[PDB]
Every structure is written in structure tokens, then in C-alpha cells.
Amino acid sequence: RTKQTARKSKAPRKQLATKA
Amino acid sequence: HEPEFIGSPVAADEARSNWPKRYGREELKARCHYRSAKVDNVVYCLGDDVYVKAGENEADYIGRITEFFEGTDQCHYFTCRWFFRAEDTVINSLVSISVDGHKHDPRRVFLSEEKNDNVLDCIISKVKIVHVDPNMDPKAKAQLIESCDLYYDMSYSVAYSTFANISTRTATLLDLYSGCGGMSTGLCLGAALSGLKLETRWAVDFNSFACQSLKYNHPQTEVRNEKADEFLALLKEWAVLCKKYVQQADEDSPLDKDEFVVEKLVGICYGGSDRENGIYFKVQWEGYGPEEDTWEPIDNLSDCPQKIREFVQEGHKRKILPLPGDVDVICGGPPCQGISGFNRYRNRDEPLKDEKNKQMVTFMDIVAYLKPKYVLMENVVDILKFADGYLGKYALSCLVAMKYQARLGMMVAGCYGLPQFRMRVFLWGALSSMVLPKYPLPTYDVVVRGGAPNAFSQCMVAYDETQKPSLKKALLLGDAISDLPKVQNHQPNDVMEYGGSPKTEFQRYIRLSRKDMLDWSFGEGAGPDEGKLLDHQPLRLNNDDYERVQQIPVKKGANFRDLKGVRVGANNIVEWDPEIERVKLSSGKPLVPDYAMSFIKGKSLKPFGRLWWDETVPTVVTRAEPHNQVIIHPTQARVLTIRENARLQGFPDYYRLFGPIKEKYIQVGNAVAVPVARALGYCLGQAYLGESEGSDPLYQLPPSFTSV
Amino acid sequence: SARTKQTARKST
DNA sequence: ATTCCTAATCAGAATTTA
DNA sequence: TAAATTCTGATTAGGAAT
Ligand SMILES: Nc1ncnc2c1ncn2[C@@H]1O[C@H](CSCC[C@H](N)C(=O)O)[C@@H](O)[C@H]1O
């Protein structure tokens, strides 16, 4: 057999704190 | 018949130049590129739009081919960038909905920039997709969608769920569910800063004390004390009346039993508290004072037609009520009480059963009827979590089904200069003729006291960890309230004086006059009460609660566990030490209440907890009782006052509130943090004036936004 | 000529 | 990494008094 | 009554452990 299924596709962290 | 590439390999120089990441020293690198490929007896070319095979019993994908290449693994690959269906975006199941007859077109997709690499064997078939300019002529539109299988007029971006177009000035604002005016005030202050004179012309709220607060601070605002759905029915009936009317001394007449000569018409409404649906006018009777005015159904006024014509001709000139097109912006923060995780009685199976939750729909019904240029809608983060975000996605799906540009963001109040956390959801909408506004980046740091839901982490308005600049230090409680004089449990004075100068930068800002805030609600010259300490009054606890907080020690983190008779046990579960008999107050009721020991399996440190100067309040809420929350003042025997809470919410001190103390607490507890609204107001004004820049969803606020 | 006063009915 | 547990959510509702 | 008083759940991000 059958037509192979295609691939459909981490974000950078957001930093609210001072150090991390 | 196997899938293969058609034609000669793309000239090496041109192949490397166009797709440089495929050559040179885990992205799939190419040995050579092609212009065409044949799959199942069909020839496909670069740029073709195709259907692509997906998971079992899942809708086929839709993609625009951008590369035909053979990898360094001898395999045949193609690259497409994905088109999103409406249900492929964050809307998901809410593609089913309807807003004033508008539904999602099945032929309308959204071009993304998401790419993927797949083998040729995945391509199903070609599909003709056309690009419709949203600002085209409607006739030229129809002939273009007539030509197509699918079409797109906007792009979709996962970041902040953006739907967007491809590739002194005055403005009117309507505040639905206006409250005491936090959101509408901030918007116009931030607008004014960007150069746009945004004016809150209309406000609707069925709480009279909220309207009394907003009307006092905004005398020109036509604030209507009525439900939003009645406001909507009135708007429709107002258009019909306007259509009907637009461009010596009277002799006496006999009057029947209840017939009286009218002087003028001084009001108009649809239904209301004791009335049923239909237009009523507030009639002023000749020879009678305003106290004798009454509401009368329009059918009782057929014998005074000129008074109606005069009222409508006259009200249409000042736009006492907006016709479609009169409204440039619609903001609103509809009730969150049916949504918020505080409510242990929500029903996740019927998220629209609560009349509070239905006001979300009524908000978009009003958007649908007035078609403002910009829509700004606020609610709590649980709107993306409760019932799997049903009501959050309902709101976004309404905007895009109406062909609005839309964006979704989560903003943290403290990030703009408050000792709060208070993450809130903000939904931008903008007509295809306008620039979609951005979200403003945090100007301060915060103590993080909550996170975003995983399904919406990409809508958090914040700096990336890799690119965060040095921001202003986090504001703490002392920076907001150390200014203020001492008050007691019983404190009934609406208006008192400050017992000192402002000590901090935040306190100097929160004390600024109206002119300094760019608050033009009183026009030239200062308004009232600039210089007075307003509503610095706590919730007047009863004798039992008062003596209870009187016994809470003035320590950091002092709570009910510090009272005589309670000690801690294993796993931090509170108990009585039997050494002490249960203490009673002068009333004969227990010093510690039973619920305090029963609260969260006896593990909570909240009951009768005291705040401290180096702490933050995560959410200023509408209730001020110290039973299930930490709201006792650090040094004084009381809870935080209305004014202290309003400072944590970012209200300028001149913003006077009205009503009972409990109602004043509700007004500040429901508000949108005024600095948050002021920041969004700058992005709204920059976008409205066509002075924004670029496709980026995030905006660094200018240095001018944080004054001297 | 002079017109007639405009009236309404007062629901009580 | 895995489990476990805490903290966090612009309160509503029942019951009990005047 | 209507006002006051008494109570207190369902999730989930993220934090401690390991
Ligand atoms: N059905 C309804 N019709 C009209 N207003 C309603 C309503 N249900 C609730 N409200 C009002 O909607 C308001 C939401 S509080 C929002 C306040 C505002 N965003 C601010 O920042 O100040 C409440 O004040 C409540 O009185």
C-alpha cells in the first residue's frame, strides 16, 4: 503493498525567569 | 511501475545555489536534484500542489512540492511545504461551528512554512490550489474560486496560531463585558503612546457598580448597564430605527386614563430586568421630574412619533449606539468563572451549559454583527485546558470562519511590571484590510508560578532561553504596597490621604496623574481625585475572622498552623497536639476552623496565611476572605485592601471604584492587568496606523514604554 | 396651524 | 531517563444563621 | 426567606526524588 504514509512533523524553551 | 525522477538532474551550480543545505559538509543531504518526478503514471513538477498519503483512516495531506532530489542513500525524495486544513490547525474539532451563518469552507486551506522530506511513493495526486487575495473584488474572487479545487487566502503558523495575509487619527473602541474598565483603559493608554487616539465609546456590563466605576473614570463613554445579548438585540433594532428616521406652539389634547404628554425621550433599551423582549424608551413626561421618568414599550409610543424621530436622529448623530462599521475595535473579557480551575463545579462534558461560558459565543455574535477592524478577547489559561480547550478553540474558529486574521498568545502580567504572575490568554483578530497586531515581549522578569499547557506552549509570549536580554528586575509585593498608610479591619473611608511619599519606582509610576498616563478621558486639565488615596479599604471581617487574623504572627509564611492548638505531623499533615484543648474565641466558636484542617487533605499552608514584602501574589482574585488563600497584609491585622489589590493589577491610583467593598474587590479581581492592556494597546495602535514592521508575531516594546 | 401635543401611555 | 508530589487554576455550593 | 457562614474537587505543569 500500500502507499506508504508520509512523515508530518522541539521548540526552543521560553525564559521568563532571570537566570533560567 | 516504480516511482522515478524525470529529466536531467538540475545543473549542479543551480542545484546547490537554490538548496544549499543539501550539499557541503540531521537534514537529508542530496546527491543531485531534479525538476520532475513520475509517480503512478502521473508527472509531477516543482511547485505542483499534491495530495500526500497519511496515517490509516486519516485525511490525506496537502503540500506544495519544493524539491525533487535523490539522497545520498540512493533513495528518491521530495520536499513539500504543508498546507493546513482548518481542522489541522489548533482549531481541531471546532471546525463544525457557525457564527452568523459563517462556516468554514472545506475548500479553504492555509499555506504554512512547515516542510518535510518524504519518498516519492507518498504522492497521491495533483490538486489545483489557487491563492485568493482577501482584498480582491468579490466578483473576481468568485471566478477564481470557481476555477479551483482548494484555495488559500492566508497563511498559518504554529507559533501563536497565526492566521495572516500572504506577503491625530481617531479610532472607536467597544468594550464588551467591560467590567470597571481595566482592559479598555489600558488599550487606549497604550494606543495613545503609539500615536493613535483610541476612545472607549461604548461599554456593556450588567453589573451596575462596574458601570459606575467605568463611567466615572470615562465620562464620555456611553456605558450601558445591561446584558450583552440584549445589547446585541438592541443594536439590530437600532439599525432599523435609524433606517426609518434620518435626514406654532402645540395645542392641548384630551388624554385617556393613562395618556400623558411627553417631553423628550432620554433612553432606549431592549428587554431588561423586569421587561420582555422588544424596544423600550425611557420617557420623560411633561411637567414631571426625572424621578418620574419610566420605561415604556415602543408600542405605547405610537402617539409620539416625532419624539422617537428626534431621539433617533439625535442619537444617530452622536452615535449613542454603534451601527456596523462605527466600531473600530472590540475588546472584551467574557466571564471566566465557568472555565477557571477554581470552580470545582464545572462540567467538562457540556462546556457551553454554563451561561457564563455562553457569553463567549455572544461575544463573537457581536463581533459578527459589527465587523470591527480589530478584535481583542481575553480570558484565562483554563480556556485552553477545560474541556480540552473547547471554548478557547471555539473563539479562534469563530474569527477565522469570519475570515479575520487571527493570532493566539499567553501573556504573564508580572512580565510588564507587576508583582503578579497571572498568565492570561489573548486572542487577536484583524480584518484582511488591517495589519494583524503583534504580542509585546516581557519588559520585566517574574517569579514563575505556573506554566502553559503543553498543547499551547508555542503561544507563550516570552523570550527564547537562547536570546533573552536583561530585563527589569521582578517586582515584589513591597514594591507595590510599602507606599501606603496603615488601615484597620474596619475602614469605611472611600477617600483618604497618603501618609508619605512614594518609595519605589513602581509606586512613583502607579501615582502618576491622568495627563502623565496619557489618559485623555477628561480631555484638557486633570480629572478628579488625582492626589487622593482611593478605596484603600480592606474586607471588613467578622469578629471571629478578625480575632483569628489578630492571632496570626507577623512572620514570613505565617498561616493558621501558627495558632495555638495545631502542630504538624508526618508527611506535613496538620493535627491537634492533644496537649492543648481546642481553643475558643470570645464568640465560643473554635479559633481554628474545621475546614482549615480539612483543606487539601490537611496539607495546605493557605488558610489565614500572611503575605510578605519579598513575595508575589500569583493571581489577584475577586474574593478577599482569608479562609482558603494567603491574603493577610504583612504587618497589619487585615487582608489586602481594594487599592492594594488594584496596584497589584496595575491600576493607576486615580482610577476610582464604586459600590460595596465586596463589589470593588470583584472589579479589580476580574480586571485585565492595566500594564498588560497598555502593552497590547501599543501593538494595536502601531498596527492600526500601519506603522508596524515584518511578519514576526512578537514585538519588543520601545524604551519609551518604560518612562523615566 | 398649531399642532397637537405628543402623548404616550404610561404602564403602571 | 522513572516515579511521585507539589503547586497552580479572573471559585460555587451547602449549610446555617437572622 | 436572605444574609452569613462553612466547606472544598479535577486536572496538569513542573518540581523533587531516583
Ligand atoms: N451575561 C452577561 N451580559 C453582560 N455582562 C456580563 C454578563 N455576564 C457577566 N458579565 C460581566 O462581564 C464582566 C467580566 S469581568 C471583565 C472586566 C474587564 N475585562 C476589565 O479588565 O476590567 C463582569 O464584570 C460581569 O459583570
Helix (H, G, I), strand (E, B) or coil at B119: strand
d(CA B502, CA B199): 30
Radius of gyration of chain A (CA): 19
Residue B278 in contact with partner chain C when CB distance is under 8 A: no
d(CA B148, CA B28): 33
Q: How far is B287 from chain C (nearest CA, A)?
A: 13
Nearest to B526 by CA among B512, B510, B506: B512
Q: Mutate which of B202, B378, B670, B672 to test ligand 1's pocket (most atoms within 8 Å of Cβ)?
A: B670
The answer to whether residues B452 and B422 touch, using CB atoms and an 8 Å cutoff, is: no
Sign of CA dihedral B7, B13, B14, B17: positive
d(CA B552, CA B566): 13
Cell for B163?
A: 492566521
The answer to whether residues B426 and B377 touch, using CB atoms and an 8 Å cutoff, is: yes
Evaluate whether chains A and B are touching (3 or more beta carbon pairs less than 8 Å apart). Answer: yes
Using CB atoms, which chains have 3+ pairs under 8 A with A? B
Resolution of the experimental model, in Å, one decimal: 2.4
Q: What share of chain B is helix, strand, coil (3-state, %, to 5)?
A: 30, 25, 45
B548 touches strand E (CB under 7 A): no
Residues whose CB falls within 8 Å of the CB of residue B629, separated by 6 or more in sequence, listed in order: B606, B609, B621, B623
d(CA B424, CA B412): 6
Helix (H, G, I), strand (E, B) or coil at B206: coil
- Residue B330: enclosing H or E segment and its boundaries? strand B329-332
Catalytic site positions of B: 336
d(CA B632, CA B558): 10
Residues whose CB falls within 8 Å of the CB of residue B703, separated by 6 or more in sequence, listed in order: none
Angle at the Cα of B220 from the Cα atoms of B428 and B239, rounded to 5 degrees = 70
Pairing of strands B329-332, B169-176: parallel
Nearest to B418 by CA among B472, B463, B468, B467: B472
DSSP E strands in B579-618: the ranges are 609-610
CB burial string B166-197: b at 16+ within 10 A, e below: eeeeebbbbbbbbbbbbbbbbbbbbbbbbebe
Q: How many CA atoms lie within 13 A of B348 on its CB side?
A: 11
Interrupted after residues, chain B (C–N over 2.5 Å): 25, 167, 247
Integer angstrom CA distances of residue B242 from B12, B239, B321, B707: 70, 5, 10, 46
Find out if CATH 2.30.30.490 is the number for domain B4-155.
yes
Nearest to B298 by CA among B270, B328, B320: B270
Integer angstrom CA distances of residue B280 from B265, B300, B326, B467, B629: 10, 9, 23, 59, 45
Residue B276 in contact with partner chain C when CB distance is under 8 A: no
DSSP E strands in B146-224: the ranges are 150-152, 154-157, 162-165, 169-176, 196-204, 222-224
| Among the partner residues B248, B250, B258, nearest to C10 by beta-carbon distance | B258
CB burial string B51-80: b at 16+ within 10 A, e below: bbbbeeeeebbbbbbebbbbbeeeebbbbb
Q: Find the farthest-apart pair of alpha carbons in chain C and give their distance in angstroms, rounded.
A: 34
Residues whose CB falls within 8 Å of the CB of residue B557, separated by 6 or more in sequence, listed in order: B605, B609, B610, B612
Nearest to B84 by CA among B25, B158, B194, B32: B158
Q: Let me know how long chain A is.
A: 20
Nearest CA to ligand 1 atom 11: B177
In one letter, which amino acid is B337?
A: Q
Q: Which residues pair with B42 in a beta bridge?
A: B39
Q: How many CA atoms lie within 13 A of B233 on its CB side?
A: 14
Nearest to B538 by CA among B601, B487, B468, B606: B487
Residues 1-20 of A with CB under 8 A from B: 3-9, 11-18, 20
**What is the distance in A from the centroid of ligand 1 to the CA of B664?**
13
Using CB atoms within 10 Å of the CB of residue B587, give its burial: 0 to 12 exposed, 13 to 18 middle, 19+ buried. exposed
Pairing of strands B129-131, B150-152: parallel
- Residue B80: enclosing H or E segment and its boundaries? strand B76-84
Cell for B168?
A: 491625530
The answer to whether residues B621 and B662 touch, using CB atoms and an 8 Å cutoff, is: no
Helix (H, G, I), strand (E, B) or coil at B162: strand
In one letter, which amino acid is B385?
A: K
| Terminal alpha carbon distance of chain C | 34
d(CA B517, CA B497): 21
Nearest to C11 by CA among B571, B50, B274: B274
Sign of CA dihedral B313, B317, B321, B326: positive
d(CA B551, CA B168): 58
Q: Which residues pair with B427 in a beta bridge?
A: B377, B408
Cell for B667?
A: 472589579
The answer to whether residues B51 and B60 touch, using CB atoms and an 8 Å cutoff, is: yes
Q: Mutate which of B177, B329, B379 to test ligand 1's pocket (most atoms within 8 Å of Cβ)?
A: B177
φ and ψ of B88, to 5 deg: -80, -30
Angle at the Cα of B488 from the Cα atoms of B487 and B493, rounded to 5 degrees = 65
d(CA B67, CA B45): 9
**What is the distance in A from the centroid of ligand 1 to the CA of B185?**
15
| Residue of chain C whose Cα is closest to the Cα of B283 | C8
d(CA B182, CA B680): 12
Integer angstrom CA distances of residue B634 from B207, B476, B606: 32, 13, 14
CA of B254 to C1' of E2 (A): 47
Backbone φ/ψ region at B104: left (φ over 0), alpha (ψ -120 to 50), beta:
beta
d(CA B241, CA B557): 61
Evaluate whether chains B and C are touching (3 or more beta carbon pairs less than 8 Å apart). Answer: yes
Cell for B380?
A: 484565562
φ and ψ of B240, to 5 deg: -65, -40
Q: Let me know how long chain C is.
A: 12
- DSSP structural state of residue B161: G
Q: Which residues pair with B281 in a beta bridge?
A: B268, B296
In one letter, which amino acid is B383?
A: I
Lining residues, ligand 1, CB within 6 Å: B 177-183, 204-207, 210, 227-228, 333, 335, 359, 670-672
The answer to whether residues B124 and B51 touch, using CB atoms and an 8 Å cutoff, is: yes
